[PDB]
Symmetry: D2
Subunit: 333 residues, 4 copies
């Protein structure tokens, strides 16, 4: 009569997952921002866990769980989970890789176009009461807006989102380069893109750089005071991937000195983001969104139902065979 | 030793046009917003005129000119000039149709994506100090953001910009319809688009309506209290064409009642636009830009040099034969 | 009780048109290749005519009709009808411009790919018993086959078919140029194509030239011994437009001397075409189809029903107001 | 003073590879179709081997080599090499995956269009002396030609070539499905394609099926008398992948009975192919090419130089670390 316990760590709404898990698991929520906010009953008894990106799990946090057997990220990125240590401790880790691919690529194009066309900043200026009566004033208030055709878009990481962004960028006349040191040669040919070997070549040729790679152990602060100086003078930066990829200290100074003309960020080193705190406090030409590139109503529901199904499959079947999107089979023992 | 006079009516900067017209015409500027601000010497002697969109010329204004022989719009739209009366009075009228086609389509896609992805509004909320720490809060602050694939984009006017917008929209998964009662049948087939016969059919099937037609004598307030009720509940409206095409009274009420979920406007019935005056004072979910969809540095220079060349051709050669973009040959006599 | 007479001049099958015209017109067929094969009753009484491309109507032929009031081409091209003289004689002339736009563009791409990839010729060689056992033999038998990406496709005439061909060619990595002296500037920008001013520039830069213009009074033998020498050495020629556009004498010699590497022709100066007669008797590297680029079952039915509707509209209503695709309103009096 | 020996097994031309390998290896050729035609000196001393697709290497053949340390396929497919046994015997096996991706996709589109548009068959009929004078005769001779827009293209294997084919097919109005049981979910979203789970679903919904998968131990005769009956009545089949994927016995009967309207094959169960021998002797509506989809001059040179570089890297450096495209690291010991 006793069912396994499944806990939603960093959230409270479990409505979407309930119809899928009802006869399979007891569902609880912790609304927790850190391991320190999880009830002892969860740490002791929880067999499965559902979590988003707002809580981090180190080996230290993972060891506090005594019965945990699977974690499912309701989302694609899993940089916030110590994946190797989880596998060592016998804990499967899964993600939901496909629900928000095109939502995120559309948000990226929106940010790219917002930098080239300055629509967001032009809207601000009108809210700020700027009067734009003459053509000379239009040119002034829209100064910096640029023609897109012929510009070079450099994509770092050509996966699901990177490929979706590349196909969209081609429609606006962008010349699309990409740097992805983990793909085998020939993907540039299938999609009709130009590829480059080193990050430096990408940054050297790109008028606008957009990040679409996972945050892993080898690319923290991939954009830093060193690689920032490799970018074109007056280039754009876009990041809907992970804030850990950008040294905001170096970015702030680049915006202030004009080396980088503008930047659009949906993710940040420390989230939630605030224009009043952080290295970007006073950085100019800065567009930011609160980690919402992923969100649509259909994407939210899609990933939550898929996450719930993965939980069911883990409880009902055999780990890790029954799992569709386990990302640490190599480490599981 | 005496050269013809050419006047820049609603502007002062003539730097781009000077090298082209130096040995051909004396160049003056009026920096005028209305006919009432033009020096008598210009009205009497001016043989050619260069103007943008910030001044209107009625038959009354046109009759005040005694020597005028050609007007050149530095831009594509010429709804601000009485074209038939100008032809009656023997005044050629030309435009520059191609300089900003893709700048304007890129601005349109930026506004479309800004409505579907709410990037602009999400940026505002962060400037307003909203804290978005949890996923529930992300869903809340980004409420309304929608998946684009499967959505129907309805294009009113499938000319230079409309076609550029259609090709771009297809890359995001839009289903593209268009209504253009002046094209012959078969253009929908060449570009792989679906066409509809009546404005009502366009509005009935479209999740997002975007205007790309000229403002002519038959489509003032094309969007009005009658046709607004023909649009889908919760649809988007985009207008980078002409503000005269939209009854802002009807639009404001539709935004307030939620019939229209959001609207992005680069043009307005009365320009310059102000969020503090007009029928849109208090309208919600409203994005606006100060008639800047056209602007890039390369587009501004391109159209100004082309405009200057048209002036040269008029003075040097025969009107209207030597003109490349005269838009009123039928009326000229 | 007496209905108007409508005659299918160069055909016999009227099944598709009958349900549309039953209560409107008496339908007869002539199965005629020339005016000399039309029954006197048709010449005297026929009020409307339906015809394809296999019969020509000069002023001489048109004058033999005494009651004719409208001709409808079941197809887009109407170069086989003296359009000006028909208008002089009070005879409306209409076409069906849209039924086969994409069928014809698909046939064109098939011919283009058949030249670059030599699939057709490679199939012939296998029917001829050629044994291709080694790689050296594959290279030999497929000699001439070329990589498409980077190649320049030059389009002459950027209308319905030309635009459909341009969009398809871009997907294969072609660089697309076009020459069309009748379009206003700005269409190259909407579709993201490069335009050229003179036929010579088109031929000078193109690795493969494809014809998509109407045959009019100013472009007979557009490709001739003079303009053929303006083409790139070893270029391809494709013609699914009209055979009258190409001087086959000049073409034959160019194929024989290797100046042109290969040619694909769906239309010819004299049709039907035969590899045993004509200036192309012995021309090498020649692919030909019997004027079938237009044909699909859905296209044949679509244009025949549309043609029948145009006939109905002419009889039932007022000429030329009620006509949707009259191509000689300027001449009708 | 003694260099390693490198042998071109199934070819004689080594000109492209010589400048790259001169100071690294002694180069010989065998022009051999089977292991039985290789000189004893090669079998004993050869340290490296270059081969195409015209010779097969079983464990039996591999064991005859005494010094062989690396095999390099000048091409992407390596189904003709026992890869597991080669790794067991300590023999690295590499391929060249990218040189002909777009050549092969262009050949595939040529075959697809040749079936839908019947250009090849229409050319044959003209060579056979068929006279096509009337429209009724055009419809007759081109019977079977079909409109492409709305048709469903089913891709089996969505790798380098499959993706290139998908993007091209979208430009013609195809609805593109694909079946690839080895990809993780989310690739359909990045490229805007519809995916299906089982081969049966692919065949059930597709008007035209095209094969783009490797020939492996689990898909020999993937198209067989069982799966052929799962295809749509009157569907098309295209195969530029591997002939071993199709049971030609089942295919022949399907063409004869009309279940399959037509088939285009660049590869065959037994190559070289002959219309006079094999299960396809008398099959109708059959287009064939002699395994030439890969060939362009630039592709041939590109893959041969890359192959030579891989050989150099193997001799000069450490196996398998220094290899860029080793396809059997898992088996090498
Ligand atoms: N802001 C948001 O709400 C969302 C953020 N994302 C983020 O966007 C990123 C991309 O997501 P997907 O495309 O689904 O991931 P994916 O796994 O499909 O693709 C990631 C690609 O990045 C490449 N990569 C890894 N390290 C790299 C490096 N140092 N340099 C260049 N390339 C590298 C990999 O080879 C891989 O191809 C992820 O980090 C994910 O967290 C994704 C969706 C929504
Ligand atoms: N905000 C800005 O800075 C810019 C605004 N524009 C405006 O955008 C509009 C489109 O410009 P282009 O594409 O260059 O014009 P265009 O002349 O190339 O195309 C206009 C099309 O609209 C169609 N049309 C006219 N009346 C219509 C109606 N009642 N319903 C449906 N279709 C109708 C015409 O048939 C024509 O095909 C113009 O009004 C122009 O003023 C253009 C560029 C920049
Ligand atoms: N083989 C077949 O069964 C078929 C043949 N066709 C032919 O293909 C041709 C194109 O058809 P559509 O695209 O429907 O015609 P369209 O009227 O849509 O376009 C024709 C274009 O050619 C341009 N043009 C005219 N003379 C020119 C010259 N000297 N140089 C460059 N451009 C020139 C015009 O400006 C126009 O834009 C027609 O001649 C038609 O007869 C069309 C369909 C099927
Ligand atoms: N005729 C010619 O000259 C040429 C032939 N080819 C052939 O075309 C085929 C594709 O080549 P690439 O795209 O470079 O290979 P690739 O390795 O890039 O892609 C192969 C794809 O097929 C999939 N696949 C494997 N077995 C499958 C099955 N049973 N059902 C569905 N999908 C399956 C794999 O998941 C993989 O994604 C190869 O077999 C190759 O030999 C390639 C180039 C030229
Ligand atoms: Ca720049
Ligand atoms: Ca909606
Ligand atoms: Ca060449
Ligand atoms: Ca069918």
């Amino acid at each position: 009569s006793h069912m396994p316990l499944v806990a939603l760590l960093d959230g409270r709404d479990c409505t979407v997952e309930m119809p899928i898990l009802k006869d399979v698991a007891t569902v609880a929520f912790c609304d927790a921002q850190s391991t320190q906010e999880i009830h002892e009953k969860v740490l002791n008894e929880a067999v499965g866990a559902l979590m988003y990106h707002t809580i981090t799990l180190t080996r230290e946090d993972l060891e506090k769980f005594k019965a945990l057997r699977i974690i499912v990220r309701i989302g694609s990125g899993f940089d916030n989970i110590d994946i190797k240590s989880a596998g060592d401790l016998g804990i499967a880790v899964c993600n939901v890789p496909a629900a928000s691919v095109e939502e995120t690529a559309d948000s990226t194009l929106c940010h790219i176009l917002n930098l080239y066309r300055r629509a967001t900043w032009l809207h601000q200026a009108l809210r700020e009461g700027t009067r734009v009566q003459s053509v000379e004033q239009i040119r002034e208030v829209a100064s910096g807006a640029a023609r897109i055709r012929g510009e070079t878009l450099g994509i770092i990481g050509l996966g699901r989102v990177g490929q979706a962004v590349a196909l969209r960028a081609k429609a606006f006349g962008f010349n699309v380069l990409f740097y992805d040191p983990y793909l085998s040669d020939g993907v540039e040919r299938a999609l009709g893109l130009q590829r480059v070997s080193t990050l430096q070549d990408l940054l050297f040729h790109s008028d606008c750089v957009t990040l679409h790679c996972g945050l892993n152990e080898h690319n923290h602060h991939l954009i830093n005071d060193f690689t920032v100086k490799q970018m074109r003078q007056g280039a754009f930066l876009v990041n809907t991937a992970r804030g850990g990829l950008v040294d905001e200290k170096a970015l702030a100074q680049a915006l202030k000195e004009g080396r980088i003309r503008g930047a659009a960020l949906d993710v940040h080193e420390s989230e939630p983001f605030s224009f009043s705190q952080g290295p970007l406090k006073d950085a100019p030409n800065l567009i930011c969104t609160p980690h919402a590139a992923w969100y649509s109503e259909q994407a939210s529901i899609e990933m939550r139902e898929e996450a719930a199904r993965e939980i069911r499959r883990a409880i009902t079947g055999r780990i890790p065979d029954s799992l569709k999107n386990c990302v640490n089979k190599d480490h599981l023992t």
